[PDB]
Design a binder for this molecule. Structure first.
Ligand code: QQ4
Ligand code: Y5V
Ligand code: MN
Ligand code: MN
Length: 183
């Protein structure tokens, strides 16, 4: 029932850096998913992963603590350390980053719908008011809590450009339509 490859899989392996592909594979397998069949979720996990890493690449050297990309047990271990060090409330859901400069966790979101729908979706799940939310879209829009976009405009514009490039590469392969209507 598991195939030897699809068009979305070969594109993902060609589109994203190999370390991004390996971490997304480990993330889905940890949660009982196979990138070879769940190929749309495979591309989304890679995209969310690259956005998280470009995000932390913005700002100072020691500004961010990367939560995404670690295994669930170690990600929660770093979260407990951050909460037990700074005093920030432990979030109910595992976030993506921690901002040592702003003293808050960040939940990064990447949507194929309107940024308005996803942000409201993540906000109603986040509860913990302290967790900052920052949503990106494949169209170039972005939403952040309190209109506080954390990073510089150049770092965010770089992320938006990459998202639209991934969109164009998918569409030229006739893979974008099935990718959008699958979120
Ligand atoms: C630290 C290590 C891996 C890091 C992953 C992350 C990737 C980072 C690499 C940079 C350099 N660039 C930029 C040019 C190409 C490249 O390579 N970027 C950012 C842009 C794309 C990319 O690739 N970073 C950040 C610190 C150094 C590093 O490599 N991760 C994985 C999750 C947690 C984490 O910190 N870790 C930590 C333990 C497991 C592991 O593997
Ligand atoms: C149960 O689903 C998974 C959960 C994990 C744990 C860590 N991932 C997140 O916490 C996370 N997931 C997503 C996400 C959700 C659905 C489709 C694609 C995406 C990209 N969007 C985020 O913003 C985020 O932070 C790993 C793989 C999964 O398949
Ligand atoms: Mn996450
Ligand atoms: Mn996220």
């Amino acid at each position: 029932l598991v195939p030897r490859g699809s068009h979305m899989e070969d594109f993902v392996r060609q589109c994203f850096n190999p370390m991004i592909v390996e971490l997304a594979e480990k993330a889905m397998k940890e949660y009982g998913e196979d990138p070879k069949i769940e190929t749309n979720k495979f591309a989304a996990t890679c995209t969310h992963l690259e956005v998280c890493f470009m995000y932390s690449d913005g700002g100072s050297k020691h500004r961010f603590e990367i939560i995404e990309g670690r295994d669930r047990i170690m990600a929660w271990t770093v979260v407990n350390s951050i909460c037990n060090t700074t005093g920030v409330e432990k979030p109910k859901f595992l976030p993506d980053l921690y901002d040592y400069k702003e003293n808050r966790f960040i939940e990064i979101g990447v949507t194929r719908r309107e940024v308005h729908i996803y942000y409201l979706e993540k906000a109603n799940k986040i509860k913990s008011e302290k967790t900052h939310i920052h949503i990106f879209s494949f169209t170039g829009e972005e939403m952040a809590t309190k209109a506080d976009y954390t990073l510089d405009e150049e770092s965010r514009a770089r992320i938006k450009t990459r998202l639209f490039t991934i969109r164009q590469e998918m569409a030229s392969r006739s893979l974008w339509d099935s990718f959008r209507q699958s979120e």
